[PDB]
Amino acid sequence: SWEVGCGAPVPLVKCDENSPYRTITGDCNNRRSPALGAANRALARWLPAEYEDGLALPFGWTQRKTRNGFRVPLAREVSNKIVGYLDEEGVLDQNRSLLFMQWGQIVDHDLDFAPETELGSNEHSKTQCEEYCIQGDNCFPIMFPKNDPKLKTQGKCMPFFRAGFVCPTPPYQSLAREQINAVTSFLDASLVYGSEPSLASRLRNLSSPLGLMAVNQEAWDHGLAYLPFNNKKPSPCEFINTTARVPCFLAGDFRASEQILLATAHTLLLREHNRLARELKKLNPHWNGEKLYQEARKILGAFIQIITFRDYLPIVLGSEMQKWIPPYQGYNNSVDPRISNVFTFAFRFGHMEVPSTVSRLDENYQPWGPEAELPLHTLFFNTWRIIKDGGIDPLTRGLLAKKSKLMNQDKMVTSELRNKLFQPTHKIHGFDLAAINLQRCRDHGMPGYNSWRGFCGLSQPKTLKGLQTVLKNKILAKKLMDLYKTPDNIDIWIGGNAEPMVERGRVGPLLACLLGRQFQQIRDGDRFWWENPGVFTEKQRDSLQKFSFSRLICDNTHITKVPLHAFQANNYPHDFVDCSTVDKLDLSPWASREN
Ligand SMILES: *[C@@H]1O[C@H](CO)[C@@H](O[C@@H]2O[C@H](CO)[C@@H](O[C@@H]3O[C@H](CO)[C@@H](O[C@H]4O[C@H](CO)[C@@H](O)[C@H](O)[C@@H]4O)[C@H](O)[C@@H]3O)[C@H](O)[C@H]2NC(C)=O)[C@H](O)[C@H]1NC(C)=O
Ligand code: HEM
Ligand SMILES: *[C@@H]1O[C@H](CO)[C@@H](O[C@@H]2O[C@H](CO)[C@@H](O[C@H]3O[C@H](CO)[C@@H](O)[C@H](O)[C@@H]3O)[C@H](O)[C@H]2NC(C)=O)[C@H](O)[C@H]1NC(C)=O
Ligand SMILES: *[C@@H]1O[C@H](CO)[C@@H](O[C@@H]2O[C@H](CO)[C@@H](O)[C@H](O)[C@H]2NC(C)=O)[C@H](O)[C@H]1NC(C)=O
Ligand SMILES: *[C@@H]1O[C@H](CO)[C@@H](O[C@@H]2O[C@H](CO)[C@@H](O)[C@H](O)[C@H]2NC(C)=O)[C@H](O)[C@H]1NC(C)=O
Ligand SMILES: [C-]#N
Numbered sequence: 001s002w003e004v005g006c007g008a009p010v011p012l013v014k015c016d017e018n019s020p021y022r023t024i025t026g027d028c029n030n031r032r033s034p035a036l037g038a039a040n041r042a043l044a045r046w047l048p049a050e051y052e053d054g055l056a057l058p059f060g061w062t063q064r065k066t067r068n069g070f071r072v073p074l075a076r077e078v079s080n081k082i083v084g085y086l087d088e089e090g091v092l093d094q095n096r097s098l099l100f101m102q103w104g105q106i107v108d109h110d111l112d113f114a115p116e117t118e119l120g121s122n123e124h125s126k127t128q129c130e131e132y133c134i135q136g137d138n139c140f141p142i143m144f145p146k147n148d149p150k151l152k153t154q155g156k157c158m159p160f161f162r163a164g165f166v167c168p169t170p171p172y173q174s175l176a177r178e179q180i181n182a183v184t185s186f187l188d189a190s191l192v193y194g195s196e197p198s199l200a201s202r203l204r205n206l207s208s209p210l211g212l213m214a215v216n217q218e219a220w221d222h223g224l225a226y227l228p229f230n231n232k233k234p235s236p237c238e239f240i241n242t243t244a245r246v247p248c249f250l251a252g253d254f255r256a257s258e259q260i261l262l263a264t265a266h267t268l269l270l271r272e273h274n275r276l277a278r279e280l281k282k283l284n285p286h287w288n289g290e291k292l293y294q295e296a297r298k299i300l301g302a303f304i305q306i307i308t309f310r311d312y313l314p315i316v317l318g319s320e321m322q323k324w325i326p327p328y329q330g331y332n333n334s335v336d337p338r339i340s341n342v343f344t345f346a347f348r349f350g351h352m353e354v355p356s357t358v359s360r361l362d363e364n365y366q367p368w369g370p371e372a373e374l375p376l377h378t379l380f381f382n383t384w385r386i387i388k389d390g391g392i393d394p395l396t397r398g399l400l401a402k403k404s405k406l407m408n409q410d411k412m413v414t415s416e417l418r419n420k421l422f423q424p425t426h427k428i429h430g431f432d433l434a435a436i437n438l439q440r441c442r443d444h445g446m447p448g449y450n451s452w453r454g455f456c457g458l459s460q461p462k463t464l465k466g467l468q469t470v471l472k473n474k475i476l477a478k479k480l481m482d483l484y485k486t487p488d489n490i491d492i493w494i495g496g497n498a499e500p501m502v503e504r505g506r507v508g509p510l511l512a513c514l515l516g517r518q519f520q521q522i523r524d525g526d527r528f529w530w531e532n533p534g535v536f537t538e539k540q541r542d543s544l545q546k547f548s549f550s551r552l553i554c555d556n557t558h559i560t561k562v563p564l565h566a567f568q569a570n571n572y573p574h575d576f577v578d579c580s581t582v583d584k585l586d587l588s589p590w591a592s593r594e595n
């Protein structure tokens with residue numbers, strides 16, 4: 001009868017039970033079990049982990065060991081045979097803007113992070129793995145199958161280190177291995193404010209009592225703010241262009257500089273905080289720095305949750321929306337708010353949503369310059385493109401004018417992400433995001449496709465033909481059986497994404513359920529949900545109810561014409577109205593008088 005409380009958390013906890021403000025670590029949300037939902041804990045397990053030795057070794061690790069009698073297919077081969085395509089034409093989503101894809105990636109980073117192994121700074125293990133592809137300890141290489149063009153020019157494999165686990169980090173033994181989530185489970189803008197105390201401070205400008213966030217001092221975007229630079233030397237952002245020498249941005253989440261389009265959206269959120277903070281000082285002169293900070297931070301969290309639940313989710317889940325996420329009835333303390341381990345693979349559906357190029361537009365929304373459209377792979381960790389070439393304006397107009405890529409059973413993930421991904425650790429633009437995702441399901445001990453179909457109460461197909469009826473595709477179904485011999489071994493990631501989309505949504509029956517469940521759970525179990533009585537005032541909520549991403553753009557950039565429904569496909573200029581016609585956030589209900 002094993003122990004029921006192990007770990008390596010964030011220490012000195014002590015809950016206030018009276019603060020009207022969230023903590024940084026996510027600690028103290030739930031009054032009865034204070035660590036539920038906090039950062040640095042094991043992700044949750046909706047079903048028992050499935051490992052080779054039933055404890056920690058992933059499937060595919062030991063050659064002679066099968067998964068249900070069959071050999072698990074190489075990640076990169078599942079990638080080459082099923083996930084890739086050449087023809088980028090016709091791939092776009094006719095009714096989903098490029099913002100549809102990008103917002104998913106924030107929410108996501110707001111919710112979950114499974115850091116890689118870390119016993120290696122002054123390392124020979126990063127090369128012991130990089131160079132001779134020897135699998136061992138925390139090195140779990142993605143071998144290249146025969147006939148992979150990459151053997152000819154890259155090597156024999158791709159570095160892939162196992163995610164971190166829970167009580168220590170040095171080679172564990174007891175219970176089943178559990179991966180850590182380095183961020184808070186709640187939708188609380190933890191990506192703009194940091195999940196650690198240690199960070200949530202550095203990011204602030206305590207040089208003054210205005211409760212603002214620290215901005216950069218070396219470069220400006222038309223009088224508007226940029227994010228502070230990161231001092232750590234290595235820089236991946238420096239690497240992609242040693243002539244420009246522009247480090248990556250410093251923010252609440254470490255993945256901020258992954259991609260020119262993700263660092264930009266971060267800029268908008270920082271700007272909104274600093275913006276909320278001065279509008280507030282100007283209405284409550286007596287408020288101190290800590291108060292402008294916490295109150296502005298409580299407003300931005302309300303923001304992230306409203307756009308996510310009101311505008312985003314209804315168009316992912318589509319017709320499945322009301323089956324999993326019922327109308328809000330109040331804070332349930334019996335609800336486990338933790339991000340489940342499978343959620344982090346289920347939300348990966350967004351990877352099939354990333355388009356092959358990224359565009360920049362000028363004031364009239366026409367191409368901005370001679371090289372306005374750029375291949376997605378040149379934008380990974382690219383901060384110099386924002387700083388020495390236009391600011392974030394030309395890039396936000398692209399967010400609104402361009403479409404997302406539509407998941408397609410024959411065109412899953414762009415080569416830009418399948419063969420030219422840049423990993424912040426190593427030096428080349430030659431990684432495969434898809435193989436990484438697949439190798440990662442195994443790392444996390446994920447149960448096969450049919451266990452989840454069973455979890456969601458859906459038909460578990462055990463035959464080629466059965467798989468054909470579920471996926472409604474003979475050829476896809478056929479290729480799957482060939483590499484997996486049984487739908488029982490189909491990895492949840494490619495498993496859930498190969499299913500056709502639901503009515504008016506963007507994911508299949510399986511993903512909608514895994515998704516819907518997790519999202520019904522972080523809302524009902526959040527003692528600080530914006531609608532939970534007493535968190536804000538009846539008058540405040542009336543103001544918050546008017547948030548819109550359009551307004552966010554209007555108040556934090558110099559765009560003057562924006563769509564009224566940013567997430568759908570908007571053609572310029574019919575669909576574009578003037579900022580004057582988009583509801584402003586009335587901050588009057590936040591005024592305060594003492595007597
Ligand atoms: C807060 O969240 C809680 C956690 O999700 C919720 O509690 C769960 O819901 C109920 C409590 O009301 C528990 O059981 C449900 O209700 C019946 C059992 O008490 C079941 O009905 C019938 O089930 C079988 C069918 O197989 C019948 O044969 C049987 O006769 C019975 O009448 C329901 O099917 C269901 O089990 C449930 O176990 C609780 N679970 C947990 C994990 O807590 C609750 O909804 C929320 N609280 C409030 C106030 O809303
Ligand atoms: C570059 C990358 C992106 C932009 C082109 C991108 C985009 C997304 C979207 C749109 C997502 C959902 C809506 C989404 C979810 C998650 N991703 Fe992904 N992603 C890029 C690159 C990566 C890399 C690299 C990883 C690391 C994978 C690994 O296992 O090593 C990655 C992961 C995830 C992820 C899991 C987060 C976690 O808990 O660790 C998502 C929920 N993405 N991305
Ligand atoms: C690395 O970053 C460099 C900038 O930090 C970048 O060079 C810059 O980009 C081009 C040169 O290729 C020039 O931009 C355009 O605009 C100027 C001014 O209007 C014109 O004179 C030019 O015709 C040009 O079209 C920049 O002036 C140039 N700046 C510098 C300092 O070089 C490199 O392209 C980047 N290298 C890689 C490999 O990405
Ligand atoms: C593009 O997406 C929007 C958003 O869903 C579609 O319009 C919505 O349709 C839903 C039906 O589920 C209605 O509830 C709303 O009236 C619409 N929402 C908004 C914000 O307008 C729109 O029709 C889609 N375009 C196409 C061709 O399907
Ligand atoms: C902290 O806030 C102060 C202002 O409250 C910032 O300094 C000001 O900002 C600019 C940039 O130099 C200039 O207008 C003045 O130099 C300063 N104005 C005032 C009124 O002091 C300072 O840059 C902020 N610190 C950080 C790290 O962002
Ligand atoms: C994905 N980030």
Ligand SMILES: [Ca+2]
Nearest residue numbers: 110184186190
């Ligand atoms: Ca969070």
